[PDB]
Amino acid sequence: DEITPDLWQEACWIVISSYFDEKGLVRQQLDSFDEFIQMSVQRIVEDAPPIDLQAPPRYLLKFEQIYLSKPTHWERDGAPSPMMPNEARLRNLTYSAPLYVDITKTVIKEGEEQLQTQHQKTFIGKIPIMLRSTYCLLNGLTDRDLCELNECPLDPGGYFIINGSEKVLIAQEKMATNTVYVFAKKDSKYAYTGECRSCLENSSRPTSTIWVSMLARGAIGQRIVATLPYIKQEVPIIIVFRALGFVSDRDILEHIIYDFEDPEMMEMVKPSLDEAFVIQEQNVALNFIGSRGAKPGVTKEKRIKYAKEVLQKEMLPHVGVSDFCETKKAYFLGYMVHRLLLAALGRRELDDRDHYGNKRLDLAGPLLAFLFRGMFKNLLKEVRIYAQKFIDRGKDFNLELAIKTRIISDGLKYSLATGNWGDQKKAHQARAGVSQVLNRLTFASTLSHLRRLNSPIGRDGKLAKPRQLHNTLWGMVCPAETPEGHAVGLVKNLALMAYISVGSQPSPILEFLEEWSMENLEEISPAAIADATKIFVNGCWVGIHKDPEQLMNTLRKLRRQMDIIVSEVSMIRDIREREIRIYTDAGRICRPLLIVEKQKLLLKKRHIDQLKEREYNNYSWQDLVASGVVEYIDTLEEETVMLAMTPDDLQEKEVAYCSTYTHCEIHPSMILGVCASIIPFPDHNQSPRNTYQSAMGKQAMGVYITNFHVRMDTLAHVLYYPQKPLVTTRSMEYLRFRELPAGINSIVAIASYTGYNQEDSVIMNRSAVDRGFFRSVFYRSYKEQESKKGFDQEEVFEKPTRETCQGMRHAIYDKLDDDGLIAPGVRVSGDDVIIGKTVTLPRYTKRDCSTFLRTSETGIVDQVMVTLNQEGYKFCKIRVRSVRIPQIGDKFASRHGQKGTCGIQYRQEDMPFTCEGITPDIIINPHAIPSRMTIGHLIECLQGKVSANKGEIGDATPFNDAVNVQKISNLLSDYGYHLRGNEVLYNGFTGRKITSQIFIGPTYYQRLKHMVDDKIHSRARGPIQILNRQPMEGRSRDGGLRFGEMERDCQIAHGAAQFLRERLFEASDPYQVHVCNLCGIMAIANTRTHTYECRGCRNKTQISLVRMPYACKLLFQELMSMSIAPRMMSV
Amino acid sequence: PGFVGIRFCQECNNMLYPKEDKENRILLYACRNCDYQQEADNSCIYVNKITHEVDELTQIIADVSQDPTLPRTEDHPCQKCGHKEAVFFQSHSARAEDAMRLYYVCTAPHCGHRWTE
Amino acid sequence: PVPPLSVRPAVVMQGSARNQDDLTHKLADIVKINNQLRRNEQNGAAAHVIAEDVKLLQFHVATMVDNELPGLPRAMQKSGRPLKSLKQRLKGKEGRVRGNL
Amino acid sequence: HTTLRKVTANTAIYYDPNPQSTVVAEDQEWVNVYYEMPDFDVARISPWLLRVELDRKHMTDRKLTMEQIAEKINAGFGDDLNCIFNDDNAEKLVLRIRIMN
Ligand SMILES: [Zn+2]
Ligand SMILES: [Zn+2]
Ligand SMILES: [Zn+2]
């Protein structure tokens, strides 16, 4: 029955494999989008108010149902056809499906003359579709079906195709809503502040933040204030309580202080009462609120109405926005004050801003919902204006012409295309970085980009606290994978078994709590709240309970049985403070864990047995979760959980550590993400090395996707001979690194050989490189289109001619065909022409606008595709193919942060060799190891020697006590090798033995995208910028290198004044001006007629020539634009 | 000394503020909203414990013994019920510097005795 | 003072559409409101109308030489991007002095 | 720097109408030992008393005595704020203030 330790390493990984058979790696994206389409769009459409318009006749126009068909495309003839994602990629279409809404317009004029007209399936917009979602044509297709459609079966999906560009929505971090968080700002007028970003269940407005603060000590005592929304002045809490109908001080403290035996709380609230005694009735308090507001009505009536509306709608919407909710709002605001007092009295800890239990991940669904709310509101507005301008004339109108569908369509398309998350007009208030271009450089880069999280703290911020790896990231975020540049700690990555909750309605839970012995908050007396336990659901205090323990037992049983409580519902019992917080909302990152009985796992051997035959008896992960054996625990419920790292922790020990565990890790290696799960032995490296590899696995070459032959990507690198690593971890089985690997096993020798590998460099074998070692192919796609925008000027693909075309370069166009397009198989060098495009003029009647190769490439045309774009003019894509043979300067890396460029390449006779004539493919310098402490590199090399000599794949899973260095060495000594991986090598040049026995063996190396040929650049009098006549910027522009301020300072320190003048004047922008010797302002010179005159001074004899930079002339002219007179006085 | 609690009027249920009656030279607690008055029984109006000599045993609740994440010990039996097992934990409360002190709670149900060594 | 064409070059795009500089668009606004104010003072206009026109002219000139005025709205252009005034042309890094001199 | 809070244990306000019969029982000895001779204007006495309790640890850590404290109070507030105190022998370091009129 029990899984014994000897079977555990199989059982756990069997369980893990079942998880990845059920979910995958992009499950969060697909589930978010599915919830958005199934629920969020319908909720948004129904939550909009019916637009009642009347001059008389009236019309309501109620939207009642939505229909999202499959993705289709409409040609110029208008025939709807099912559009495949690959066709969208090739034709630069948007993989979107039409959204139709049912509309009901009832005519009501007078005399009960009512009649309803329903417009079924009114086309309301087009919604882009996430690939492999339920509403994707690739849904449920087999691998054969996907290959029939020219799709990769290993492609995870989880992205959109907008204008042929694959866009991926990055999950955005945000502070959780409807939760009270008591912080303390050191530099502020308030000692303590308790904030609550409140938002109603079905979002319709932004988060309304309410603060309840305490004024810092230094009138008599500490005063509690409340910064309500839409009010620009602090308001005493007692005033707010009275404005809600609680005038008696006893009632207010009944709502705030639940234990009247506690004078400390009492004296700390007393200043607030003493400050609010002149105001003693609800109307006066409402008038005070309205007066403190930023729109103080001259008459107290409208002041009181405004205060009523604010306290009913903007104050704590999550508690309830309807009327008669003042009791719930009073209880909740009293809870906020109670929490603030507990913090000020030291009875509760301040809340941690960085705790991921306090955060939420805004995924594709809830982000598209924000867009859709804004866009549907704008659409209903436009419909209101259109219908109003017609009914004002007293006649009917056609809603089909009122609905301008471009709002929703173009809005979603623009937002996903650019990443600016918001309305196109508010292009600066909008937050960019959402919806990035999917990284297709290697399969690991694609997976990681699809599992990418973002902390929008702002890269400019230099506070390290949000960048720090918090304790609560354990199991939810990769500890290693993070960019090492300016976004350290802000851009994160999901751990492998991390699941972001999609969201759920609290209705069944609330109903069960009602049927259960919970007492509502309006029905109780406050005297009961002392000993009772509060119950919050999605931040709303809904009631109280008397035995929280057996309530938690009941709820956990219900969630483990897949009863009314769904698996993703978090249920935290804080014991010391008697809250029970239940969460069903979306964005809660959680992970699966094995539940533990008294001191035993519930995962018995029968579950492993049924999981082994997963493909026959359809016993899956969901059956494991439904059995009550596995549980999803979120960051906030982990605080109440006692984990076992392994079932070995559940053994009874000579001194028991815990003996009351509640859960167990499925495997600790699941704390790593996609790119860190490729590192072998990451627990033997320094952690920065693991981070650098997690970044560098994403630039590694491989086969980024199986269907690369049909993709017209702008840039693509494919390795000739990718190999799976000889030394692998058990997590790559689910990353599909074995099916799409990104490196080669290289016989690497760590040695000092000729000095060409010093300081992070490598010596490669020229003979191996000749045999296809780390050879790659680079595919570059050029796009072009001939626009017939108007009869004024039209472009067209056609072989240009020297007699008709004007802007025709001296390059030869013979490689083009009569259609103007080069043919596949044609070898093209730099500056060559691949598309001959000519544009009609207003060298006559047509000008050359041909597409050249990006300079200095020298490839062969791989293929040419011709089609029609969305509007329907001819559209061409040409993929050119360039074989990249590794060379000096190309960057290579192992899986341990050990990067370096090729210093030199030696032939096989020049490389050092073992007694059996094995030469290293790569030689790396021993000095790269000691400071870096990448012992995982050495253990991987030794394990790889054992694996190659044994005919197996080494197990480098991080935390594995069945694999240590002594075992690997003992294994290697059985194959006739030195147990530590050393060998006697001979000098290739002289054949003499090397005195020091070299450490050599197979290690998995990666070829990175950074090849020297894509970086080398030179300039000598090339093109210049228009504004300031200085060299351009970039290799692509044939630009010059920037001689910056620091270079100026260095050369000033050198004392090299002529070199400094050459760099900053003569090699950048030499220029001449003519200055009036009297006024010092630039004069008018006419060198052809030799007439120089200053219009200002009315002189034409006292002019002087001045040699100045063009940028300085431009500066002085831009100062004269500002009415400044910079007078260059030559005397 | 001990703290002093707030007391409310019997008519308006607002807090009673302190006042002095010169005629009898006696402390009274009177409401500044209604016209109620009361004869005080403590004679003390304000108390500040700067030292903050708070007995944290009063802040503990027996329910904490149900926490699976707290450590348990068999070496400190309960003086009230004789149960062997007991959870222990530190103060973890602000304004307490010498907070390495351990507080124990009996894990027996319905006993919930709390103490300190 | 309206600068010359070198300070605000009209760059030609791939086709024939000549795109004007931000300074040129701003000067267009300034000349528009200046002519509008000139006619409104010359012909029938209310005092408050002339006042509003003068206020708008002030806004245009100020945002031509300095666009980041606190409180005031930023001078806008097509695509919702604020215009680059003469001050941002040389305010700091990547300006004339640090970025080109 | 040492303020009265750094060395104070706990402060309290009482309503003592006659100092002869104090509200507290343990402060009846030294109060009568002080009051049997008229040291100040007993008529200019207020029934509101302010009793502060010190702590021996902080008193000793600064080599401080009630004499210096009372002198500092009577200097900062003059005679308007009467202060009295016992010797540095009792188990509780206590000193009583009243407001003069
Ligand atoms: Zn002049
Ligand atoms: Zn009263
Ligand atoms: Zn006990």
Swiss-Prot record, chain B:
It is found in: Nucleus, Nucleolus. One of its GO terms (biological process) is transcription initiation at RNA polymerase II promoter. One of its GO terms (molecular function) is zinc ion binding. CDD domains: Zn-ribbon_RPB9. The keyword Acetylation applies. InterPro entries: DNA-dir_RNA_pol-M_15_CS (IPR019761), Rpa12/Rpb9/Rpc10/TFS (IPR012164), Zn_ribbon_RPB9 (IPR001529), Zn_ribbon_RPB9_C (IPR034012), Znf_TFIIS (IPR001222). It comes from the Eukaryota. Zn(2+) 2 binds at C78, C81, C106, C111. Its main location: nucleus. Zn(2+) 1 binds at C9, C12, C31, C34. A zinc finger (C4-type) spans 9-34. Keywords: Acetylation, DNA-directed RNA polymerase, Metal-binding, Nucleus, Transcription, Zinc, Zinc-finger. One of its GO terms (cellular component) is RNA polymerase II, core complex. A zinc finger (TFIIS-type) spans 74-116. Belongs to the archaeal RpoM/eukaryotic RPA12/RPB9/RPC11 RNA polymerase family. Component of the RNA polymerase II (Pol II) complex consisting of 12 subunits. DNA-dependent RNA polymerase catalyzes the transcription of DNA into RNA using the four ribonucleoside triphosphates as substrates. Component of RNA polymerase II which synthesizes mRNA precursors and many functional non-coding RNAs. Pol II is the central component of the basal RNA polymerase II transcription machinery. It is composed of mobile elements that move relative to each other. RPB9 is part of the upper jaw surrounding the central large cleft and thought to grab the incoming DNA template. This is DNA-directed RNA polymerase II subunit RPB9.
Swiss-Prot record, chain C:
Coiled coil: none annotated. Transmembrane segments: none annotated. Signal peptide: none annotated. DNA template strand binds at K93. The tandem heptapeptide repeats in the C-terminal domain (CTD) can be highly phosphorylated. The phosphorylation activates Pol II. Phosphorylation occurs mainly at residues 'Ser-2' and 'Ser-5' of the heptapeptide repeat and is mediated, at least, by CDK7 and CDK9. POLR2A associated with DNA is specifically phosphorylated at 'Ser-5' of the CTD by CDK7, promoting transcription initiation by triggering dissociation from DNA. Phosphorylated at 'Ser-2', Ser-5' and 'Ser-7' of the CTD by CDK9 (P-TEFb complex), promoting transcription elongation. Among tandem heptapeptide repeats of the C-terminal domain (CTD) some do not match the Y-S-P-T-S-P-S consensus, the seventh serine residue 'Ser-7' being replaced by a lysine. 'Lys-7' in these non-consensus heptapeptide repeats can be alternatively acetylated, methylated and dimethylated. EP300 is one of the enzyme able to acetylate 'Lys-7'. Acetylation at 'Lys-7' of non-consensus heptapeptide repeats is associated with 'Ser-2' phosphorylation and active transcription. Regulates initiation or early elongation steps of transcription specially for inducible genes. It is found in: Nucleus; Cytoplasm; Chromosome. It comes from the Eukaryota. Component of the RNA polymerase II (Pol II) core complex consisting of 12 subunits: a ten-subunit catalytic core composed of POLR2A/RPB1, POLR2B/RPB2, POLR2C/RPB3, POLR2I/RPB9, POLR2J/RPB11, POLR2E/RPABC1, POLR2F/RPABC2, POLR2H/RPABC3, POLR2K/RPABC4 and POLR2L/RPABC5 and a mobile stalk composed of two subunits POLR2D/RPB4 and POLR2G/RPB7, protruding from the core and functioning primarily in transcription initiation. Part of Pol II(G) complex, in which Pol II core associates with an additional subunit POLR2M; unlike conventional Pol II, Pol II(G) functions as a transcriptional repressor. Catalytic core component of RNA polymerase II (Pol II), a DNA-dependent RNA polymerase which synthesizes mRNA precursors and many functional non-coding RNAs using the four ribonucleoside triphosphates as substrates. Pol II-mediated transcription cycle proceeds through transcription initiation, transcription elongation and transcription termination stages. RNA-dependent RNA polymerase that catalyzes the extension of a non-coding RNA (ncRNA) at the 3'-end using the four ribonucleoside triphosphates as substrates. An internal ncRNA sequence near the 3'-end serves as a template in a single-round Pol II-mediated RNA polymerization reaction. May decrease the stability of ncRNAs that repress Pol II-mediated gene transcription. The gene is POLR2A.
